Amino acid sequence: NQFYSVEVGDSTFTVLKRYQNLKPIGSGAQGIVCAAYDAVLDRNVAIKKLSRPFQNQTHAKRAYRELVLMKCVNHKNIISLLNVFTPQKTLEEFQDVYLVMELMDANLCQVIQMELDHERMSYLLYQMLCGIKHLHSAGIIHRDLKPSNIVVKSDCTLKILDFGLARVTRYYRAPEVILGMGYKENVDIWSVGCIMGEMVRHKILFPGRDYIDQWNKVIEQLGTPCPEFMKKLQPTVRNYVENRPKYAGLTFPKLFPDSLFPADSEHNKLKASQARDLLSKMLVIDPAKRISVDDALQHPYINVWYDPAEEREHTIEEWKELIYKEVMNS
Ligand SMILES: Fc1cc(-c2cc[nH]/c(=N/c3ccc(-n4cnc(N5CCOCC5)n4)cc3)n2)cc(N2CCOCC2)c1
Numbered sequence: 001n002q003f004y005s006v007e008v009g010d011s012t013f014t015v016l017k018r019y020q021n022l023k024p025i026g027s028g029a030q031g032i033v034c035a036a037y038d039a040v041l042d043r044n045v046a047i048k049k050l051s052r053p054f055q056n057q058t059h060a061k062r063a064y065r066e067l068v069l070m071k072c073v074n075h076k077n078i079i080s081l082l083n084v085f086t087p088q089k090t091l092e093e094f095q096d097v098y099l100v101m102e103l104m105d106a107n108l109c110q111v112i113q114m115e116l117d118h119e120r121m122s123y124l125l126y127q128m129l130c131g132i133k134h135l136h137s138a139g140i141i142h143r144d145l146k147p148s149n150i151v152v153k154s155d156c157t158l159k160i161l162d163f164g165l166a167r168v169t170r171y172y173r174a175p176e177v178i179l180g181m182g183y184k185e186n187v188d189i190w191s192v193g194c195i196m197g198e199m200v201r202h203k204i205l206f207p208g209r210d211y212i213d214q215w216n217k218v219i220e221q222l223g224t225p226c227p228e229f230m231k232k233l234q235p236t237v238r239n240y241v242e243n244r245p246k247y248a249g250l251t252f253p254k255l256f257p258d259s260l261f262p263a264d265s266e267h268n269k270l271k272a273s274q275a276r277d278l279l280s281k282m283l284v285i286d287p288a289k290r291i292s293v294d295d296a297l298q299h300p301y302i303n304v305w306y307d308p309a310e311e312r313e314h315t316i317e318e319w320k321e322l323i324y325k326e327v328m329n330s
Pocket residue numbers: 025026027028029030033046047048101102103104105106107148149150151161162
């Protein structure tokens with residue numbers, strides 16, 4: 001009797017009666033996420049349904065990670081779980097997991113549409129780098145950060161929704177992932193560069209129409225990479241890059257003109273310089289040349305926010321056991 005059902009999108013959410021007035025908030029790769037109101041806590045929450053997460057390896061490792069690491073990757077800038085629950089009575093009938101989170105006012109897509117403000121942008125970027133620093137400290141390298149999986153409250157507080165990849169749309173993925181040529185921690189830095197440049201441009205930086213067109217749209221802008229970057233590409237992929245035309249790219253001033261930034265001040269003039277110098281350090285193809293999370297936090301555009309104070313594979317059935325026992329703990 002504790003549960004009721006409601007249509008959400010193309011699906012059915014079955015949730016505890018404390019959650020009321022379910023309104024679609026958006027959708028993603030675990031489908032619809034609903035806003036609701038929590039009567040027992042008297043606030044708004046966001047509810048996401050994992051439909052058969054144990055169904056295959058990739059769904060299962062993702063749900064399982066999300067469920068365990070939410071208990072130890074505590075963060076100021078990482079969203080938190082208020083509640084996890086299934087409407088099913090036993091392991092045998094177990095099907096779906098519902099993840100309940102604090103409700104945030106918008107995603108970054110919505111904030112990118114706004115006019116360029118230097119205090120807002122450096123604040124947001126600071127929080128993002130910090131959230132990511134903490135992801136790394138806990139052994140999590142995300143690899144999939146995009147405006148749609150970062151959310152912000154109305155006072156510009158920011159939280160990363162999820163933990164990303166395991167281990168068409170590649171607009172924000174790093175050159176080292178596209179090419180499947182191995183990665184280190186500064187892979188997340190590239191996604192922060194794409195996001196910051198989009199705040200300046202109000203247009204997707206690398207808006208590819210295919211896996212191939214994505215790579216050109218990146219080389220057309222930043223220029224072709226060096227010989228040392230190349231020699232590290234797995235032999236099939238090495239030929240497609242090396243054998244293309246050489247592209248020269250554009251200077252960061254011509255990638256992000258003066259006309260995109262506020263002005264008629266020396267503050268604004270300094271800030272524009274700082275923004276572009278950070279852009280030029282994040283938006284670098286070769287991961288060996290790309291600024292790290294720590295140096296990005298010390299960057300003069302960002303450091304004004306500093307505050308003295310601060311793998312195994314399993315059976316379907318074993319995954320179901322694992323996930324189910326995690327749901328029965330809190
Ligand atoms: F206006 C808004 C307020 C809030 C909001 C506020 C609080 N918590 C919250 N919880 C959320 C929201 C969304 C997601 N995911 C969305 N996509 C995925 N994927 C797809 C690919 O990668 C794997 C999982 N998770 C997860 C938790 N969402 C959320 C948005 N959208 C709604 C969802 O989409 C973009 C943000 C808009």
